[PDB]
Amino acid sequence: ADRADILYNIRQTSRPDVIPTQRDRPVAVSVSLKFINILEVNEITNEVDVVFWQQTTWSDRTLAWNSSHSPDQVSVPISSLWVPDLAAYNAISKPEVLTPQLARVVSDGEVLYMPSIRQRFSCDVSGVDTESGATCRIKIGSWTHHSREISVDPTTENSDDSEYFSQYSRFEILDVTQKKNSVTYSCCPEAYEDVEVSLNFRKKG
Amino acid sequence: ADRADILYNIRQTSRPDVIPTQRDRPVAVSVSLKFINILEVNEITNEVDVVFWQQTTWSDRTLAWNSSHSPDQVSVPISSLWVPDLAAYNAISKPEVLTPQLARVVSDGEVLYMPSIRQRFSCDVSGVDTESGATCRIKIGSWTHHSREISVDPTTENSDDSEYFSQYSRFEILDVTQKKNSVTYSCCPEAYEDVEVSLNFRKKG
Amino acid sequence: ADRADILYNIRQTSRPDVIPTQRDRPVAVSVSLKFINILEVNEITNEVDVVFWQQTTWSDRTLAWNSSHSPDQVSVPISSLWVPDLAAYNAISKPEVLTPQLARVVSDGEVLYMPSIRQRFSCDVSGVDTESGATCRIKIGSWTHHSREISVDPTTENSDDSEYFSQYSRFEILDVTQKKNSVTYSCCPEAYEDVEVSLNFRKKGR
Amino acid sequence: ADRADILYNIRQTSRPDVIPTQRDRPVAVSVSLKFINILEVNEITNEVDVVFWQQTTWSDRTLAWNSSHSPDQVSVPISSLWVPDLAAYNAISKPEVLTPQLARVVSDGEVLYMPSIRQRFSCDVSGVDTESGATCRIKIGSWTHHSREISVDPTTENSDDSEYFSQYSRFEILDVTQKKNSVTYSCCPEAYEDVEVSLNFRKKG
Amino acid sequence: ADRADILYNIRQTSRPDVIPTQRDRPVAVSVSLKFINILEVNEITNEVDVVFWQQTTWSDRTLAWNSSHSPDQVSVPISSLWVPDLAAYNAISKPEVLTPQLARVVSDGEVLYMPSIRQRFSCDVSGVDTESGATCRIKIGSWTHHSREISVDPTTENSDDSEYFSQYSRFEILDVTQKKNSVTYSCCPEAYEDVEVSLNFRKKG
Ligand SMILES: CN1C(=O)[C@]23C[C@H]4C(C)(C)[C@@]5(C[C@@]41CN2CC[C@@]3(C)O)C(=O)Nc1c5ccc2c1OC=CC(C)(C)O2
Ligand SMILES: CN1C(=O)[C@]23C[C@H]4C(C)(C)[C@@]5(C[C@@]41CN2CC[C@@]3(C)O)C(=O)Nc1c5ccc2c1OC=CC(C)(C)O2
Ligand SMILES: CN1C(=O)[C@]23C[C@H]4C(C)(C)[C@@]5(C[C@@]41CN2CC[C@@]3(C)O)C(=O)Nc1c5ccc2c1OC=CC(C)(C)O2
Ligand SMILES: CN1C(=O)[C@]23C[C@H]4C(C)(C)[C@@]5(C[C@@]41CN2CC[C@@]3(C)O)C(=O)Nc1c5ccc2c1OC=CC(C)(C)O2
Ligand SMILES: CN1C(=O)[C@]23C[C@H]4C(C)(C)[C@@]5(C[C@@]41CN2CC[C@@]3(C)O)C(=O)Nc1c5ccc2c1OC=CC(C)(C)O2
Ligand SMILES: *[C@@H]1O[C@H](CO)[C@@H](O)[C@H](O)[C@H]1NC(C)=O
Ligand SMILES: *[C@@H]1O[C@H](CO)[C@@H](O)[C@H](O)[C@H]1NC(C)=O
Ligand SMILES: *[C@@H]1O[C@H](CO)[C@@H](O)[C@H](O)[C@H]1NC(C)=O
Ligand SMILES: *[C@@H]1O[C@H](CO)[C@@H](O)[C@H](O)[C@H]1NC(C)=O
Ligand SMILES: *[C@@H]1O[C@H](CO)[C@@H](O)[C@H](O)[C@H]1NC(C)=O
């Protein structure tokens, strides 16, 4: 009936180390990077320092409860949940998580986990100080799950790419495009999926 | 009763991972910053390194006990308590909490959590070296709770804004204004509340 | 009967999250800083990096045991003990604890917790390169316990201020004075207590 | 059974603090460094800052389950598994793990743990600005397990040395060779095994 | 007995927080530093950054077992063991432990804990760029145990001073001497013991 019951009941069924595959179908994870800031850019070392929302949604039907005469959503610590093992492939620093580590769980089992992350990347910084700008490509996918266990797809909101971008950054955003790739590597027989986020940005003035 | 008994009861009653909303009424959180130091400012990157008390006040009326023949108040570690999931939206560093992580809990269920935090912010540093100074705006609100779960209000009684501000800072405070915002974003149908703190400050002339 | 027994009996009565007051009297905490080093000084930013022992003593009668056929004292991890919530009010960095987090506990329930700490302070560094030197003032008190719950007093045994100060520092100590303040603030009706430690130091000459 | 039963069983029988030896044979560990980036190099101090995958494989046959009808692989938190106590002998910083801390456990008991690590090393940086380049040697072996308890060989995979190395690095990889050593030391009458990775790299242009 | 039974016997017998003294007598601790690297030196501030093995051996005969038809030794995590509360008295940084936190336990009850540590020291750096070099003195002893509870003594042999010292350091070791001291201090009536390590080193030319 209350939010304590809902949580207790999540923990009875929720297995944080068990991927919540429905039948033998992958977990469909939505990924959308929302850039908040570009703090440090190095044209010689080809490194950028960015703040972004790593917006991550998926379904876990074992979390699902009856929202009749109950709250329809709750905030849940991510240690009580299974969370995709997403890694930015071209990161050169540990993710610095700036926000409380809470997921929004809906009563149909939908999970919204939207951390704000500060992280350093190896990417093409050339042309940052030009009209056309530089294009930094950030690849995010699962570390240990191939395409039959986790699929990753870009979702976008219709709103402008820089509606949440700091006006006090030295840089401005020209365009953010998100591409899905499905690649088979030399380690493993199954294909791994990633979202490739192309940040087209340049200095102001 | 005694202090041991009050702490034991809180351990039995307090659900750290469950928002204490009785009858689906929003938890009213009092948020206000008291600035202690300004350590670093960068005119070009528009970044500031500040020390402040993040003064957080609310009621968890499940914690409440009868203090007729018992202490009125106890200091409690915050790990035993629910604490609001507040984030500084324009912070570019994790909060460096400088103080023991204890909240003061009153017999009526009022919780006083007043950590001292060092944190870096992306904000307007323009004019900092002038007599008018810069106005750095810092927004704080819940990360995962809308207005019907967490409301945020500023505690705006008549006090000196520099009362506890270090005389040994290279900077000085002209004014601190605190204002409540209620905004509906595209993500979600419900309004999210935030307190915007406007720090008017300058390099000492 | 042995050290094992004492640590077990401590773990049965000790409540690390419960302040061990006797009657409605405050816990009497002795705080004194012993300066080991001054590492980084900046007169422009008014910031100092210092290494000091934060010598902290108090009574916890919940720890007390009968030491007739038993050892008088044990070393105990501080996680098993209540420890005062002391903060250096003008610190600008979290304390960097250099030493094992063990307290010495005597059978009468006296606790001696003497961590070596490196910490950065916002204080008055003006005059550091003069004969008179700078006077940097450090204020240490409880974060959450008013004067009816924690009293702080300086432990002044009239020692040499430089007794344990590094000869290899670029700085030397001219004097250390430690005084108790009782102040009532706008937040609260009850008085809060602090020890104010005044470190008068200078750059060495030549 | 469902992946929940496989994972519950793995961590049920798994003994993280006990080396899973079979019939007094050493636990055969395979080690391989895949170089992703060189971030900082200092020829004066002879220090390099490297991002690399530490590819570690071994068998714990006590984890084996029948996978005729079941999934034959699962992702498991390393905290639940025994892990070889490997150390980079000439590292001058603790390893910074960038990636989710999950191993891949196969139905026959094989464990694949491939963390992405940022670490600093003491090694020969002389010649980095020349055409021949510098050769930085990284030694990796057990800290407490001799050759009768842990053996360490390089994987037979002599892949492309610069396969996943960033095109956006300042540096380029010329050659990577991996050789095994068996050394006896003054401390100990038993031999200790290590893989020596020789990284021949230089600045581009 | 297998490696698990030996560990479980240690866990039922060893107490991390209880010093394993016999009657009124101290635990005889052997301490020797083995210098691996000297990374940063500053003759103005008298500060050194060094990597060394803190080689710590002692006996706990309560841990002993019959090894005739069982393993002679096991690696054990230090959280299962009492370990000496040793501090480097003139350290100005927290010990950065570079290596897995495992002790070697022998069937006769000897414990060998040999962490590799990077740590900064306040000590005499004067003459480091000369033929005589600097003599940096490091003192190691128990933080909380007097001489009737813990005795410290240097290990019986410095096989060679430069044996495992990095040939890639800007510095070289001329000599290492390790002597024992027993000192009565103003705090306490009981004598404390320490090992004074004198590192005679110079810049290479
Ligand atoms: C060597 N690898 C493994 O064994 C697996 C699956 C592999 C992949 C596909 C994620 C892996 C490394 C990975 C990391 N994973 C750990 C266990 C594993 C079997 O799932 C891989 O094999 N190739 C990767 C990988 C990650 C990221 C990547 C890859 O390829 C190229 C460029 C960059 C930008 C570095 O992006
Ligand atoms: C995308 N988002 C979510 O899905 C929710 C609620 C959203 C809000 C309202 C807190 C969110 C991001 C948030 C963060 N939250 C995580 C889960 C969530 C549904 O509660 C949001 O949607 N808009 C925000 C937000 C945070 C801060 C913010 C926002 O808007 C504009 C400027 C800045 C200064 C960056 O401040
Ligand atoms: C705002 N505050 C509180 O509400 C209480 C008690 C307050 C005090 C008295 C410790 C507090 C902040 C404190 C910290 N505590 C957290 C809960 C509390 C009621 O115990 C305070 O109210 N004033 C303080 C305080 C700390 C330090 C300090 C203070 O005053 C002036 C200057 C400097 C040098 C910064 O030193
Ligand atoms: C002194 N040492 C010990 O007592 C053991 C086993 C030893 C070895 C062989 C791993 C040890 C240090 C080690 C570390 N181990 C901890 C317990 C031990 C008995 O397993 C050692 O004895 N020699 C080592 C060692 C580690 C690394 C090393 C060594 O030798 C040469 C060069 C460098 C680059 C420094 O690499
Ligand atoms: C003040 N101190 C105590 O009360 C005790 C025992 C003391 C000693 C002897 C370890 C202590 C500090 C110590 C640290 N210990 C914590 C509890 C204690 C009673 O064991 C001490 O009292 N003198 C020390 C000490 C440590 C290191 C040291 C000391 O003296 C001289 C030079 C330097 C280089 C600073 O080295
Ligand atoms: C949810 O609860 C309602 C009211 O109690 C009930 O009618 C309905 O059957 C429940 N839903 C499911 C899926 O059982
Ligand atoms: C608290 O307890 C006292 C004494 O037991 C009692 O008189 C009083 O009614 C109680 N308070 C309330 C609000 O009921
Ligand atoms: C301590 O124990 C002894 C017996 O060993 C006893 O005589 C004495 O009364 C005890 N002390 C106290 C305070 O009870
Ligand atoms: C695995 O499972 C099958 C089907 O249950 C069983 O018949 C068989 O004995 C097992 N196979 C092996 C090789 O152990
Ligand atoms: C150790 O065990 C063997 C039998 O396995 C036995 O011969 C020997 O006596 C035992 N040692 C001791 C000291 O009891």
Query: What is the token pair recorded at D29?
Result: 């560990």
Residues with Cβ within 8 Å of A96's Cβ and at least 6 positions away in sequence, in order, are A117, A118, A119, B93, B94
Query: What is the token pair recorded at E62?
Result: 């309560």
Provide, as residue numbers in chain A, all residues whose Cβ is less than 8 Å from the Cβ of B44. Answer: 170
Q: Do C122 and B168 touch (CB under 8 A)?
A: yes
Alpha-carbon span D104 to A145, nearest angstrom = 9
CA D142 to chain centre: 11
State the ligand closest to the CA atom of A107.
6
Query: What is the token pair recorded at A41?
Result: 């850019």
Residue of D162, D136, D173, D139 lying closest to D43 (CA atoms)? D136
Name the residue with the closest Cα to ligand 3, atom 21.
Answer: C185
Touching chains B and E? (3+ Cβ pairs < 8 A): no
Q: How far is C118 from chain E (nearest CA, A)?
A: 7
State the ligand closest to the CA atom of D149.
4
Residue of A104, A13, A97 lying closest to A61 (CA atoms)? A13
Query: What is the token pair recorded at C125?
Result: 């560094």
Provide, as residue numbers in chain D, all residues whose Cβ is less than 8 Å from the Cβ of A93. Answer: 96, 98, 118
Give, as one character, the DSSP assignment of residue E12: H
Alpha-carbon span E202 to E200, nearest angstrom = 7
Alpha-carbon span C180 to C141, nearest angstrom = 10
DSSP character string of chain A: --HHHHHHHHHHH--TTS---STTPPEEEEEEEEEEEEEEEETTTTEEEEEEEEEEEEE-GGG----TTS-SEEEEEGGGS----EEETTB-S--EE-S--EEEEETTSEEEE--EEEEEEE---TTTTSSS-EEEEEEEEESS--TTTEEEEE---SS-TTSSS-TTSSEEEEEEEEEEEEE--SS-SS-EEEEEEEEEEEE--
Alpha-carbon span C85 to C144, nearest angstrom = 7
Q: Within a 10 A sphere around the Cβ of D46, how many other Cβ atoms?
A: 23
How many CA atoms does the CB half-sphere of E152 hold within 13 Å? 32
Q: Do B19 and A80 touch (CB under 8 A)?
A: no
Nearest to E102 among D46, D91, D143 (CB): D143
CA dihedral over A81, A85, A91, A94, signed as positive or negative: positive
CA dihedral of C188, B143, D76, D152, whole degrees rounded to 10: -80
Q: Is the CB of A64 under 6 A from ligand 2?
A: no
Task: Output the ligand 4 site: residues, CB below 6 A.
Answer: D 89-90, 139, 143-144, 185, 187-188, 192; E 36, 53, 104, 112, 114, 164
Q: Do C92 and B4 touch (CB under 8 A)?
A: no
Query: What is the token pair recorded at A205?
Result: 């003035």
Alpha-carbon span B146 to C71, nearest angstrom = 58
Nearest to E122 among C37, C100, C102 (CB): C37
Q: Within a 10 A sphere around the Cβ of B9, how many other Cβ atoms?
A: 15
From its phi and psi, is residue B13 left (phi > 0), alpha (psi between -120 and 50) or beta? alpha
Q: Are C136 and C126 in contact (CB under 8 A)?
A: no
Q: What angle do CA D125, D127, D131 make, to 5 degrees?
A: 135
Q: How far is C23 from chain E (nearest CA, A)?
A: 30
| Buried residues in D147-185 as b, exposed as e (16+ CB within 10 A) | bebbbbebeeeeeebbeebbebbbbbbbebebeeeeeee
From residue C109, how far is each of C20, C63, C112, C205 by CA, in Å? 11, 5, 10, 47
Provide, as residue numbers in chain B, all residues whose Cβ is less than 8 Å from the Cβ of A97. Answer: 94
Alpha-carbon span B190 to B199, nearest angstrom = 29
Strand-pairing partners, residue D77, are D102
| Buried residues in A84-96 as b, exposed as e (16+ CB within 10 A) | bbbbbbbbbbebb
State the ligand closest to the CA atom of A64.
6
Alpha-carbon span A34 to A51, nearest angstrom = 9
Residue of A178, A149, A22, A10 lying closest to A84 (CA atoms)? A149
| CB pairs A-D closer than 8 Å | 68
* Structural method: X-ray
Q: Do B145 and A96 touch (CB under 8 A)?
A: no
For residue B158, give the chain C residue with the closest CA: C186
| Buried residues in C5-27 as b, exposed as e (16+ CB within 10 A) | ebbeebeeebeebbbbbeeeebb
Query: What is the token pair recorded at A31?
Result: 């990924």
Q: D67 alpha carbon to ligand 5 midpoint, in Å?
A: 60
What three-state secondary structure class fits B105?
Answer: strand
Name the residue with the closest Cα to ligand 1, atom 24.
Answer: A185
Q: Within a 10 A sphere around the Cβ of C92, how many other Cβ atoms?
A: 23
DSSP character string of C41-53: EETTTTEEEEEEE
Alpha-carbon span C76 to C6, nearest angstrom = 10
For chain C, count helices (H), then strands (E). 1, 12
State the ligand closest to the CA atom of A159.
2
Alpha-carbon span B103 to B114, nearest angstrom = 7
Name the residue with the closest Cα to ligand 2, atom 34.
Answer: B89
Query: What is the token pair recorded at A8?
Result: 């207790």
Mark out chain C residues that contact chain B at CB-CB < 8 A: 15, 17-19, 21, 44-47, 85-87, 90-94, 122-125, 143-145, 149, 186-187
Q: Is the CB of A1 under 6 A from ligand 6?
A: no
What three-state secondary structure class fits C141?
Answer: strand
Query: What is the token pair recorded at A110?
Result: 């939908």
Q: Do C93 and B39 touch (CB under 8 A)?
A: no
Query: What is the token pair recorded at B80?
Result: 């035993």
Query: What is the token pair recorded at C115?
Result: 């961590």
What three-state secondary structure class fits E65?
Answer: coil
Q: Considering just the CA atoms, what is the radius of gyration of chain A in Å?
A: 19
For residue E19, give the chain C residue with the closest CA: C3
Residue of D63, D20, D14, D58 lying closest to D149 (CA atoms)? D20
Sheet containing strand B171-183, strands side by side: B86-88, B134-142, B192-203, B171-183
